[PDB]
Amino acid sequence: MRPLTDQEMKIVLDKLANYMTDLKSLIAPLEDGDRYVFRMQKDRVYYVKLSIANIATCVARDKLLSLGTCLGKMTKSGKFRLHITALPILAQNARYKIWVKDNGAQPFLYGSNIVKAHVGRWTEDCPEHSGCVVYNMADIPLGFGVTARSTAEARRLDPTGIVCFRQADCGEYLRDE
């Protein structure tokens, strides 16, 4: 493994602040004098406890395949892409939320965009290109993405209309099987 560099952590925190509300909560120290850290193994970043990372160093580089929760990967062009594996953190501290009925929840898992015919609840005053985590009617985190229009435009929108751009969904777990 290797800790993130300053620019790499700047990029990762830019994306994380795009999708989440508070981040000092993530990097806050815990009761037992332990804290969460960020590490990179084979152009993947992993959110993991410092104790777990320090006990995972005994593993040789070629043999470490996972550690904690995989947030995403840094691409060859130097940009961070977030993952459905990083969805749980997003659910914990999400900024904007979008609830979808079953009729759109199943398509969202199949890998389709969210539609006004699917939306069942909004978050008031959501700007155009903002960070919204997609849940179902049972408050179960289903995915995350960036919304298409604002709340007013979505309300005025044709019900057969795109309201959210899909970026990651729980169906990729059915892929990596």
């Binding site: 759109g104 398509p107 969202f108 389709s112 965009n113 539609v115 057969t160």
Partner: protein
């Protein structure tokens, strides 16, 4: 073999539906985005998620083949065996990745019912077979076992 099978018996949505769902989710259809492969293929698992690299290749239900007619030369016999995996198509790496079955195509076939005794005293449970017909013209797959 057939009596053994008979006594043994005595003892998700399709990619077209998924594509229609994605289309209902997405307003604008890019021209020619739906790229259906018009060749017979083998898939295996009933429901799976494909990589975004290959999420544009649609393999139709009517063209999916799961079972083939394999001929053993040394013991001259033709038996119907299930296909395990498309191993190599000497025409296109894309074809062998999508599992396209063409003429002269190396595939893995289950020979469990045939009962081949090997050198180590094993029992054969998977062997290479070369598809030697044109499944695109003939609604069947004919292969010869490389044994």
């Amino acid at each position: 073999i057939k009596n053994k099978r008979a006594e043994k018996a005595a003892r998700g949505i399709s990619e077209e539906e998924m594509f229609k769902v994605v289309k209902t989710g997405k307003k604008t259809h890019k021209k020619g985005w739906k790229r259906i492969v018009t060749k017979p293929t083998f898939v295996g698992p009933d429901f799976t998620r494909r990589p975004v690299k290959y999420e544009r290749f649609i393999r139709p239900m009517g063209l999916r083949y799961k079972k083939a007619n394999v001929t053993h030369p040394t013991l001259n016999v033709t038996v119907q065996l299930p296909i395990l995996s498309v191993k190599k198509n000497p025409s296109n790496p894309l074809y062998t990745q999508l599992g396209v079955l063409t003429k002269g195509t190396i595939i893995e076939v289950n020979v469990s019912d045939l009962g081949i005794v090997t050198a180590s005293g094993k029992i054969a449970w998977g062997r290479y077979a070369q598809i030697t017909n044109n499944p695109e013209n003939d609604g069947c797959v004919n292969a010869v076992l490389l044994v």
